[PDB]
Amino acid sequence: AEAKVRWPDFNQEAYVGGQVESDKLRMDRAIPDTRHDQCQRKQWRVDLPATSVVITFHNEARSALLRTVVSVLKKSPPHLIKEIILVDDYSNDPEDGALLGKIEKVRVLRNDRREGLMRSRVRGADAAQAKVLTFLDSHCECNEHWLEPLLERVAEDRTRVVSPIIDVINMDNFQYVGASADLKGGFDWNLVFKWDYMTPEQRRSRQGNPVAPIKTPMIAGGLFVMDKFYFEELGKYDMMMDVWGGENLEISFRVWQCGGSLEIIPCSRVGHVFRKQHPYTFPVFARNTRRAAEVWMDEYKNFYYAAVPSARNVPYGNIQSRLELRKKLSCKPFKWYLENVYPELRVPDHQDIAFGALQQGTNCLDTLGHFADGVVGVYECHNAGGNQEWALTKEKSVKHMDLCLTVVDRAPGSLIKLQGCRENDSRQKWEQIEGNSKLRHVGSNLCLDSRTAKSGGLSVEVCGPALSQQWKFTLNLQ
Ligand SMILES: CC(=O)N[C@H]1[C@@H](OP(=O)(O)OP(=O)(O)OC[C@H]2O[C@@H](n3ccc(=O)[nH]c3=O)[C@H](O)[C@@H]2O)O[C@H](CO)[C@H](O)[C@@H]1O
Ligand SMILES: [Mn+2]
């Protein structure tokens, strides 16, 4: 009638009643412990800073919202939970939120109108009372001893921003499934999140301790833990971002560049319900992405626009207060981030005309592992690099490592060969034509052509209508 109640006495049958398989689960339903064996018995500390848990939402399924909430209360030592702040971001039925205010520790905040996730998180952060923030989606389920490992890290160094491994809760059947602990957040020049294997070096490093924290260039997304002061000092979130994501890019760039670090803490596990086709699970409105790139990427932004020319036409708002933030924080340049934080991301030479994979539909130019005077071919694109990595240079050659596509015989039907690059060589000079849709051999009417793949390899051929002569570099600078 007016009282707060302990989570087990909450009337879930009532709340939920008033995909579907969500309402079938109990609010405190059991889930497999997906942790490494060594997390089992590590001894976590009593003397850790309590946290305010901000969960922001807009028309979340009640069964899932509730499940997140109890998940936190059930699996976190209660002395480390100061409060759980739910930010209702103008859900249509205010009751979805307000009803949960009845539970111990929960506090619910309402928005007049859709403010989006960024602004909602800032609201929750501001309302928080604890020294440390924990942000979670409205559809998560925390696993055993999920919280202590995160807090241990920020307690020790305020400038760490730490994420759990994010397990997967299936959107259809709600099976809780363990994710890998052997991956890092990354991206391609199109600023699309991808997962990376660890440094063959980094793997060795971890032999002595397989559950050690792991530095990550790019945050997996929204579940993370951060000192409240630090959060505010580094400028919170970009309040001008619209509700379509890519705040992950901006926060990752900002923390790293401005002196902080990002981490993934393998002993910390939180399930998440992934939407269909989300970039975490399946391998673009650019506003937010441009706001990141135009403030943080210095001149490398031009590789983003090389990958995504469409994006140069997307208006992105005023970024002045953000540029000023960067100045004040004396943040290091993007060049530094690439060299120190994400050296494995392949960066074109600043005088390369085009770079990346050279693809024809969904096939990619491939060396076939043919390291000297070899013929060349195609494989299905795999968006790793290696044998599928090429550049069009200032010198006008199509090169992979220090080998160059070479017209060895100008007769139509002649196979091209991969030879050592020489700037002398007229036989290794190529140019883009027809709006960067083909490769013509400079000084001829010969075009790179896959007609012959099944019969020897790629060939030079008289430039024509053939679609076996269509080739697009992933990045073009013209
Ligand atoms: C587990 C994880 O890493 N999740 C991230 C991922 O979430 P998801 O892609 O799973 O989406 P989400 O869970 O953040 O939100 C679900 C939908 O409701 C919207 N919504 C949600 C809350 C809110 O306060 N206001 C609002 O408008 C949101 O715009 C989205 O379309 O991608 C997001 C980019 O947008 C953020 O990086 C999330 O934190
Ligand atoms: Mn989500």
From Swiss-Prot:
Protein residues bound to Mn(2+): D137, H139, H272
Membrane-topology descriptor: Single-pass type II membrane protein
Protein EC: 2.4.1.41
GO cellular component: endoplasmic reticulum membrane; extracellular region; Golgi apparatus; Golgi cisterna membrane; Golgi membrane; Golgi stack; membrane; perinuclear region of cytoplasm
Keyword field contains Acetylation: no
Phosphoserine sites (modified residues): S444
Subcellular location per the Swiss-Prot or TrEMBL entry: Golgi apparatus, Golgi stack membrane; Secreted
Catalysis: reaction(s): L-seryl-[protein] + UDP-N-acetyl-alpha-D-galactosamine = a 3-O-[N-acetyl-alpha-D-galactosaminyl]-L-seryl-[protein] + UDP + H(+); L-threonyl-[protein] + UDP-N-acetyl-alpha-D-galactosamine = a 3-O-[N-acetyl-alpha-D-galactosaminyl]-L-threonyl-[protein] + UDP + H(+)
CDD domains linked to this entry: beta-trefoil_Ricin_GALNT2, pp-GalNAc-T
Site positions for Not glycosylated: N424
GO biological process, alphabetically ordered: O-glycan processing; positive regulation of immunoglobulin production; protein maturation; protein O-linked glycosylation; protein O-linked glycosylation via serine; protein O-linked glycosylation via threonine
Region spans: Catalytic subdomain B: 213-275
Function: Catalyzes the initial reaction in O-linked oligosaccharide biosynthesis, the transfer of an N-acetyl-D-galactosamine residue to a serine or threonine residue on the protein receptor. Has a broad spectrum of substrates for peptides such as EA2, Muc5AC, Muc1a, Muc1b. Probably involved in O-linked glycosylation of the immunoglobulin A1 (IgA1) hinge region. Involved in O-linked glycosylation of APOC-III, ANGPTL3 and PLTP. It participates in the regulation of HDL-C metabolism.
Free-text domain note: There are two conserved domains in the glycosyltransferase region: the N-terminal domain (domain A, also called GT1 motif), which is probably involved in manganese coordination and substrate binding and the C-terminal domain (domain B, also called Gal/GalNAc-T motif), which is probably involved in catalytic reaction and UDP-Gal binding. The ricin B-type lectin domain binds to GalNAc and contributes to the glycopeptide specificity.
UniProt protein name: Polypeptide N-acetylgalactosaminyltransferase 2
Gene name of the encoded protein: GALNT2
